[PDB]
Design a protein around this ligand. Structure first.
Ligand SMILES: Nc1nc2c(ncn2[C@@H]2O[C@H](COP(=O)(O)OP(=O)(O)OP(=O)(O)O)[C@@H](O)[C@H]2O)c(=O)[nH]1
Ligand SMILES: Nc1nc2c(ncn2[C@@H]2O[C@H](COP(=O)(O)OP(=O)(O)O)[C@@H](O)[C@H]2O)c(=O)[nH]1
Ligand SMILES: Nc1nc2c(ncn2[C@@H]2O[C@H](COP(=O)(O)OP(=O)(O)O)[C@@H](O)[C@H]2O)c(=O)[nH]1
Ligand SMILES: [Mg+2]
Lengths: 426, 50, 50, 143, 427, 426
């Protein structure tokens, strides 16, 4: 009934989405060959949200892969659960962007994006009642951030009534992979505040610290981080695919969390996240989930929430739980830490419960907090933007393509007034 | 002999030069004008729908 | 020397061997894209009218 | 058992020198050790396989047994017409000489010997059906 | 469907000596004459286990003919089919057209008559000659004239050998060339120029044979002939007979002089290394570095082109390649036709000859076009004909044989009229 | 009962007909040796429409091959389903026209056409009630176009009451085989506009494009192209051979497609055409078939249908389908693409259903649309003809044979007023 088209852009989007489709297919019991192998009939009535039946028990994901270099597409097709994607949905260039936002927004987009638009248009009309779109991409790269940015703009002006999620990793000074990270991030954020409905900020630094202490991994390869991100996304949309005692759809979360149409950047967390050596010594109850949920070292962004205030927050629970215990828990955590919440809004917490836990766990949760501390990350980026922009470093590889300097001045102006209004509402 | 070789090369480089394609430019112009007409027609039809 | 000079000037003006074909294909690609956009606009407009 | 390979047919590849010394019984000289090392492999994997060792030894036996003269031309003109025809010298310098004469021969001197089987899998970006044909591309969109 | 091949002159039957060597290896026929229906267009099968070609070698001097009679192909050729005069024409058109032709042409025509009556589905004739010499030019024209009288409507493919501009071996070849054309205009239907200097360049550049003899030249000429009759001999995806050049390549009854070319001319070491496909050979067949006539078609504008394809080739990519040629601007076509091509595809790949310098190639191209550069060649020869005729040089030889100055003057103006025709049509 | 004789002219006609009789014989279950070995009795009931009884379960096709060079005939006898034709039907000349329309219409026709007329007259009198004749040929070649054209004229003056189908390929400048393409195509069209009842315009250009885009093949030999055209011919003629919920015979389609006696040039399209890689990742729905039918890239002519308006269009469905879904799908297409249809004719769509799908599929459809876009192709050809005739190129191989100049001027006039009246009705 309610439908979600999934879009993966760039290298980060493809790898994360690949692991994401593994997690979802496992939850719905589809083997890597694309046939049904589950046991419960509860998985059967809600596969139209993510899959389309082709011919007698063959379910294909409703996804669109998009990049510019065949290396990523092959890494997709080589891995397990890599043969279930419809080969028509692999719209794909040949030359490569190369961390150039202008190349991802003016040069290569002009020949790739009409094609991706036709593919997504056919996939959107394959279903009847759209609920929204779900876009996974990065913010530093060129083929991911720039091209995904244009795709969001085109979609928002095509279907203006449907919701839109975007999960984007953001740069950090310590984990600073690309050198034009600020030049890409500022322009992408500048477009996301004018097009996207809401964005959920990720970063590799917080994921690293999480798998350091909580997971106690020794060699945390990228597969594990993408496994965490995938677990988060499934936790987001658990409510549409499963019945619960208090259903919270995508639009329901958005209208509960966005007080003002420019305040839609969330910080995310997940729980339980306990090491294999410590899963035996712990308890499984809602306070055990909650007091790990609100922990600042469990957030998936590099923004200490106790350096600012929460505007709103939301919890999505999965498993057989007691709603009384849920609400009294949210009540107590809001009364105890009263200063860290905003004053002019009562009941800063939206909560929901679903009746199906993920496989392997008895009870899980997902935390989506709209805090004001994100302005520190934006300042951290904008100052680097101004530092490079004072003496025009790396500027000509954007300038000599068609983009002018005014775009940068506009982007920095928007970032500055955006952190001003975060600070203002704090 | 060498002068003849260079002359032939010059005329070849002269043949290779341009990219005008005037009739295609005119086709492009009429397509863009038709697109503009249909866009204003679209917004007018939306107003009528309201 | 005169033919050498004129040869160098024409070689500077032609901008490269693949330039003409790159330009022609770019024009053709623009034509195809514009035609597709125009058809999509017609579809939108007829949906509005129905 | 830690390498998880049947070891009965395997020597440690570091034992090649001592094996040559025991084979000759006298001592290895420089031109003997050179041939031994260039015909067998001593660089990539410490474990050895009997069949690899045999494959190398056969070539070594041939090399010792027979000799092809490096002078395949006695007429500069005929050699030169072969050079302009791009017909190449049939014989191989590794079979012909004991050591390399020049630095480029020294560059390519070790390519002949049989490679040891890769003890591990190889990660190679290989083109797939989606990339080769099914996947949508700009060229396909334009026809 | 049968076609018979007659060879005139010293160069003609040496070309035949390479052509029939190629045909026998193609159809698996040993030189003794017997195999150890595709052959039916060239060899008629007498009695039991014996095929005898549909050809007549003819010459005035018996030296090269009885070299054939004593060569390796003694049994293959019918003893009567080889025809030899008693004394040569000696580089003398008038001598080889009025003095000795009057003795030899009757025996030749009364022989081809019974070869045709042996035949059933005669497609046409194809003639082999060089116009620089005396025998090939003189009685070649005489034989063509009486053939046009006897049959007329049948096509005649003329693969002539014109003299090169700068590399040349005779002295009076301008007189013989001009006098041979004057009848080659209104007698031949389809005439293909083959020059030796361009073949020397091809063997030097591509085949990298720095010391080529006449054997190598005749070898790849046989490759060209075999490549444009392979459609008749074997079935292909898109075949083309001998009557199609007549229509598809001759826009006007007196403009029929086709450049030829071939690709890929590749030696043994350059094959196992180049990656061969259809696009690159379709390109390489159009450069002047691979034509069979030393002229610059960059100066000219094409009228029509024919593309024979042999081997592993599909109609898709040959269509894509000819599209790339049509869209390139380094060559230009005439406005008198927008459709300037005619493809043709045959399945069997070109065979290799023992001792031949070419390699086993998967696919090959034979291009036969028509342009205005040939109009430039005729003027180039016309210049050096005027130079020698202005001083009345060598004229006494022809007048002694029995001719006059009228045919010199009228052949000169006939070539001028033809020059007018090319510069007119090129407009 | 109702009868259809088959006439194949030219090399293209012969090979197309070879694949056609292969696929029809397969549909009726008769083996390449000519004996019936099928299962269902439904196949036996309607084989007299295309066959005659010989001896002991041997059925011969009611086909007449006609050419001028034995290479065609050998290629027919060589392949499978080649030993089922009656050798008396191998009426066949000896010389060859050589892409000369005058040779195919005045010299060699004078001695071959009495023989082909004798054998077709014998085959027509042998059956009881003719429905029509069916001719497959080219418009570029000489022995095919010219000879088949005179045959059409002789047949129409003899039997003016029987229908007529002509599958004719039209040359395109981008796929340009021979040099005298316009000199032959203009003359043949000039005769077809007054002789044939209707024509199905084909070209190799759209076939190559379809194999590139939809089929995604490597080496599209002539076998697959002729396999596609044969599939179209089996689809257009399926209504007679198999009972359905709504039948539409040849005359039925003609009167539903031809509003004016000179407006009888059709373009065709066939579906489903999907790659083997994406063959299992899809479903088989009526909307899935309809979107592939009305796609402009699926027409088998090099005429962009969005450059004009359809006068009328017809769809022939095969397979167990829902008529309600068929009708509402046609209604949806006629509503959404409301500008591409002519205004002064409501309900421009004819539809029919047959209950037997083609072998190897679940459900299929054949599209036959009489649009106004064909005037682009005729202009595309006539401008070439005027370019050559302005300066009399290649003219003498026709004039010196018996044709005169006013024939070319008349063919120009007939091409010119035809494209004028197409432009008028646009
Ligand atoms: N391409 C090629 N040309 C040849 C060959 N042999 C002779 N020629 C050409 O023939 C021309 C002279 O005529 P010839 O064929 O030698 O002798 P001819 O044509 O019989 O005339 P006569 O000598 O009077 O009998 C020269 O210009 C040569 O270029 C050959 O084997 N290959
Ligand atoms: N979690 C995760 N992050 C990744 C992965 N690959 C790249 N990234 C992040 O993406 C950022 C650069 O994005 P990039 O790969 O260049 O995007 P693209 O090239 O445009 O597709 C780096 O800072 C990485 O931290 C991955 O597999 N997993
Ligand atoms: N689809 C298809 N077209 C062909 C085939 N053979 C030839 N053609 C087309 O037919 C045209 C030439 O027709 P041609 O064979 O000369 O006709 P004919 O000489 O009168 O018999 C060319 O433009 C080709 O594209 C074939 O096997 N399949
Ligand atoms: Mg001689």
């Amino acid at each position: 009934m309610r439908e979600i088209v999934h879009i993966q852009g760039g290298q980060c989007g493809n790898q994360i989405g690949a692991k994401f489709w593994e997690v979802v297919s496992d939850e719905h019991g589809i083997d890597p060959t694309g046939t049904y192998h589950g046991d419960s009939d509860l998985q059967l009535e809600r596969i139209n949200v993510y899959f389309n039946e082709a011919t007698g028990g063959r379910y294909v994901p409703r996804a669109i892969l998009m990049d510019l270099e065949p290396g990523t597409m092959d890494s997709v097709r080589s891995g397990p659960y890599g043969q279930i994607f419809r080969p028509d949905n692999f719209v794909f260039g040949q030359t490569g962007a190369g961390n150039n936002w202008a190349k991802g927004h003016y040069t290569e987009g002009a020949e790739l994006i009409d094609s991706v638009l036709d593919v997504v248009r056919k996939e959107a009309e394959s279903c009847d009642c759209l609920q929204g779109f779900q876009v996974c991409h990065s913010l530093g790269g060129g083929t991911g951030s720039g091209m995904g940015t244009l795709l969001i703009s085109k979609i928002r002006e095509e279907y203006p009534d449907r919701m839109m999620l975007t999960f984007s990793v953001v740069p950090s000074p310590k984990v600073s992979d690309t050198v034009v990270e600020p030049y890409n991030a500022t322009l992408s954020v500048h477009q996301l505040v004018e097009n996207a409905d809401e964005c959920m900020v990720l970063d590799n630094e917080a994921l690293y610290d999480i798998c350091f202490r909580t997971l106690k991994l020794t060699t945390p390869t990228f597969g594990d981080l993408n496994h965490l991100i995938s677990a988060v996304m499934s936790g987001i949309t658990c409510c549409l695919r499963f019945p619960g005692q208090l259903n919270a759809d995508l639009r329901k979360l958005a209208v509960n969390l966005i007080p003002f149409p420019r305040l839609h950047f969330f910080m995310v967390g997940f729980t339980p996240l306990t090491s294999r050596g410590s899963q035996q010594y712990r308890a499984l109850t809602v306070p055990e989930l909650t007091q790990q949920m609100w922990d600042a070292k469990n957030m998936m962004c590099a923004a200490d929430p106790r350096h600012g205030r929460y505007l709103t927050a939301s919890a999505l629970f999965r498993g057989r739980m007691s709603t009384k215990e849920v609400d009294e828990q949210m009540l107590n955590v809001q009364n105890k830490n009263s200063s860290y919440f905003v004053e002019w809004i009562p009941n800063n917490v939206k909560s929901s419960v679903c009746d199906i836990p993920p496989k392997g766990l008895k009870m899980s949760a997902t935390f989506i907090g709209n805090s004001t501390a994100i302005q520190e990350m934006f300042k951290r980026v904008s100052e680097q933007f101004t530092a490079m922009f004072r003496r025009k470093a790396f500027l000509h590889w954007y300038t000599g393509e068609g983009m002018d300097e005014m775009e940068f001045t506009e982007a920095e102006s928007n970032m500055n007034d955006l952190v001003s209004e975060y600070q203002q509402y704090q | 002999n060498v002068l003849n070789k260079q002359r032939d090369d010059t005329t070849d480089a002269s043949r290779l030069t341009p990219g005008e394609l005037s009739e295609e430019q005119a086709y492009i112009q009429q397509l863009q004008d038709e697109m503009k007409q249909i866009d204003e027609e679209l917004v007018e039809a939306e107003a009528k729908n309201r | 020397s005169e033919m050498g000079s004129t040869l160098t000037t024409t070689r500077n003006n032609m901008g490269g061997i693949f330039s003409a074909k790159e330009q022609s294909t770019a024009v053709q690609k623009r034509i195809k894209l514009l035609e597709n956009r125009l058809e999509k606009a017609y579809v939108k407009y007829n949906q509005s009218i129905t | 058992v830690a390498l998880e390979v049947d070891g009965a047919t395997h020597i440690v590849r570091a034992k090649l020198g001592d094996i040559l010394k025991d084979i000759l019984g006298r001592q290895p000289r420089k031109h003997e050790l050179d041939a031994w090392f260039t015909h067998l492999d001593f660089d990539r994997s410490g474990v050895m396989g009997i069949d690899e060792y045999i494959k190398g030894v056969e070539r070594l036996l041939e090399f010792s047994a027979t000799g092809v003269t490096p002078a395949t031309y006695s007429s500069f003109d005929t050699q030169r017409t072969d050079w302009v025809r791009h017909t190449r010298v049939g014989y191989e310098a590794q079979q012909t000489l004991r050591g390399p004469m020049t630095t480029a021969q020294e560059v390519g001197w070790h390519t002949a010997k049989p490679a040891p089987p890769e003890t591990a899998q190889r990660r190679t970006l290989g083109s797939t059906d989606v990339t080769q044909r099914e996947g949508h591309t700009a060229a396909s969109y334009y026809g | 469907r049968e076609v018979i091949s007659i060879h005139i002159g010293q160069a003609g039957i040496q070309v035949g000596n390479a052509c029939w060597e190629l045909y026998c290896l193609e159809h698996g026929i040993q030189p003794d004459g017997q195999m150890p229906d595709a052959f039916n267009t060239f060899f008629s099968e007498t009695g039991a286990g014996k095929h005898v070609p549909r050809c007549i070698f003819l010459d005035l001097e018996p030296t090269v003919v009885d070299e054939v009679r004593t060569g390796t192909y003694r049994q293959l050729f019918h003893p009567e089919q080889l025809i030899s005069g008693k004394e040569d024409a000696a580089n003398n058109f008038a001598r080889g057209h009025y003095t000795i032709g009057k003795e030899i042409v009757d025996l030749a025509l009364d022989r081809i008559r019974k070869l045709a009556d042996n035949c059933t589905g005669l497609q046409g004739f194809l003639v082999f000659n060089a116009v620089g010499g005396g025998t090939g030019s003189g009685l070649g024209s005489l034989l063509l004239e009486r053939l046009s009288v006897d049959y007329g409507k049948k096509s005649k493919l003329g693969f002539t050998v014109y003299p090169s501009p700068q590399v040349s071996t005779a002295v009076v070849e301008p007189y013989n060339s001009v006098l041979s054309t004057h009848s080659l205009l209104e007698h031949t239907d389809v005439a293909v120029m083959l020059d030796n200097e361009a073949i020397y360049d091809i063997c030097r550049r591509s085949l990298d044979i720095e010391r080529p003899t006449y054997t190598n030249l005749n070898r790849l000429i046989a490759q060209v002939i075999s490549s444009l009759t392979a459609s008749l001999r074997f079935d292909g995806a898109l075949n083309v007979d001998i009557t199609e050049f007549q229509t598809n390549l001759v826009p006007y009854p007196r403009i029929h002089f086709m450049l030829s070319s071939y690709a890929p001319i590749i030696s043994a070491e350059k094959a196992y290394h180049e990656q061969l496909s259809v696009a690159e050979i379709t390109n390489a067949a159009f450069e002047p570095a691979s034509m069979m006539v030393k002229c610059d078609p960059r100066h000219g504008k094409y009228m029509a082109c024919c593309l024979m394809y042999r081997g592993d080739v599909v109609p898709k990519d040959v269509n894509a390649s000819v599209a790339t040629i049509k869209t390139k601007r380094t060559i230009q076509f005439v406005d008198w036709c927008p459709t300037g091509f005619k493809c043709g595809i045959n399945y069997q790949p070109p065979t290799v000859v023992p001792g031949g310098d070419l390699a086993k190639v998967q696919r090959a191209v034979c291009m036969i076009s028509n342009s205005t550069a040939i109009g430039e060649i005729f003027s180039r020869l016309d210049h050096k004909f005027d130079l020698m005729y202005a001083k009345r040089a060598f004229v006494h030889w022809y007048v002694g044989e029995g001719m006059e100055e009228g045919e010199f003057s009228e052949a000169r103006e006939d070539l001028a009229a033809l020059e007018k025709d090319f510069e007119e049509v090129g407009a």
